[PDB]
């Protein structure tokens, strides 16, 4: 199945991590844990803002422009991205904004980190209507020495 994984400020505001006003190493660990040994699909913006490829996974970059690195697979459409994953139980889609919009209709599962922060931005995770998505897991945490804000992990499954 196809899954989306995302870190969301309030009102579904998203961004590249290194520009967001927070430090959430716990989210980092949750991300690696839920993507480990799965193919990931990302947009070029996200690809750039992490420099290297995610280790041990098929890394698939969706871009209209030609590839600029041979350690990853470069595709030019949603269908091409999916096809390049071959036969696996789960594909992880890791952003960013337009990428999330494109894959949401094909996804059966969401992995979301809610972050207790208000941040200005023009990029948002797509609207996931409560009537369409069942919350099957929620795990609340508060701020500590390592994590700057309260954060809540959530998994939802398409009804």
């Amino acid at each position: 199945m196809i899954s989306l994984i995302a870190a969301l400020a309030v009102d579904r505001v998203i961004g590249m991590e290194n520009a967001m006003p927070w430090n959430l190493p716990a989210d980092l660990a949750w991300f690696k844990r839920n993507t480990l040994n799965k193919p990931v699909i990302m947009g070029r913006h996200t690809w750039e803002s992490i420099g290297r490829p995610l280790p041990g996974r098929k890394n698939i970059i969706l871009s209209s422009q030609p590839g600029t690195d041979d350690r990853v697979t470069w595709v030019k459409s949603v269908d091409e991205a999916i096809a390049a994953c071959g036969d696996v139980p789960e594909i992880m889609v890791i952003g960013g904004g337009r990428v999330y919009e494109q894959f949401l209709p094909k996804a059966q599962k969401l992995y979301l980190t809610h972050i207790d922060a208000e941040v200005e931005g023009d990029t948002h995770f797509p609207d996931y209507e409560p009537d369409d998505w069942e919350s099957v897991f929620s795990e609340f945490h508060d701020a500590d020495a390592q994590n700057s804000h309260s954060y809540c992990f959530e998994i939802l499954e398409r009804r």
Partner: nanobody, 127 residues
């Protein structure tokens, strides 16, 4: 999802009163919360709001610098600390939960959607 205001009663002008609002319902800590006040016959006035995790607040200009809203998710409670009260502050104060998850204080205030309301607590300031 259900709310109960507490605190409040008579206070002299210039004094302080602390209100609390306790919720029953497991999913409390995924909703913004707000305080409102109302005198008989008049529309509700927005007073304060706070995000789900309690880090970020928004205040009506009429109470800014005087009122502080805060939150304790481990106790399913939000509070309203009211200092330097005036006769004009006299009203029924209500607690309200957002109908939608994980919104900003701004959305809570400017795009109203109310999951539920408390029964209210009377706050009365003399002169």
């Amino acid at each position: 999802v259900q709310l109960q205001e507490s605190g409040g009663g008579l206070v002299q002008a210039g004094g302080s009163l602390r209100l609390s609002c306790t919720a029953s319902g497991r999913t409390f800590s995924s909703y913004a919360m707000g305080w409102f006040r109302q005198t008989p016959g008049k529309e509700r006035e927005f007073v304060a709001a706070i995000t789900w995790g309690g880090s970020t607040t928004l205040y009506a200009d009429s109470v800014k610098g005087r009122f502080t809203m805060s939150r304790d998710n481990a106790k399913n409670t939000v509070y309203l600390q009211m200092n330097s009260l005036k006769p004009e502050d006299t009203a029924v104060y209500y607690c309200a939960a957002d109908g939608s998850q994980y919104r900003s204080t701004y959305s809570f205030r400017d795009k109203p959607d109310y999951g539920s309301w408390g029964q209210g607590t009377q706050v009365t300031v003399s002169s």
